[PDB]
Amino acid sequence: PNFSGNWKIIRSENFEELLKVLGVNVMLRKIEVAAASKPAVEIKQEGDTFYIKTSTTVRTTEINFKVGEEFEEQTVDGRPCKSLVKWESENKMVCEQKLLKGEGPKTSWTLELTNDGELILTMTADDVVCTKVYVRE
């Protein structure tokens, strides 16, 4: 499955709750919810090498990684971390994150491309799971 494309959101659950359990204050949560309501996601996949750009009114994030090689990014609440992505199946990857400085909840994310061509992102902080679903433009 090729993840490459421009993706637009169709469903989102538990995003504000995920930020809440990470301790993000309500003003900042509502700003993130606003931003997240109209995102653009662009992915370029070349085999195990990925570029993913996520753009909203508050920021543009770009990550470049190769499956199986550590890279640096930020947690969903903005903390710098080392990340490592591995395949769980031919359609789904899972990323484990470790903070660069300090301690905090265990955070991770996953990305799956379904047989129906939907992209499902999950983001987890300990027991709380946010799921966002996208379709390819």
- Binding stretches for Cl ion (CB under 5 A): 52
Q: Name the residue nearer to Cl ion (CB basis): 52 or 130.
A: 52
Minimum distance from CB of 62 to Cl ion (Å)? 10
Minimum distance from CB of 35 to Cl ion (Å)? 10
Minimum distance from CB of 116 to Cl ion (Å)? 20
Q: Name the residue nearer to Cl ion (CB basis): 19 or 52.
A: 52
Instruction: Determine how β-strand 92-99 pairs with β-strand 107-113.
Output: antiparallel
Q: Name the residue nearer to Cl ion (CB basis): 78 or 117.
A: 78
Distances (CA, A) of 16 to 12, 35, 67, 99: 10, 12, 29, 21
Q: Name the residue nearer to Cl ion (CB basis): 18 or 52.
A: 52
Minimum distance from CB of 121 to Cl ion (Å)? 6
Contact 96, 83 (CB under 8 A): yes
Contact 68, 84 (CB under 8 A): yes
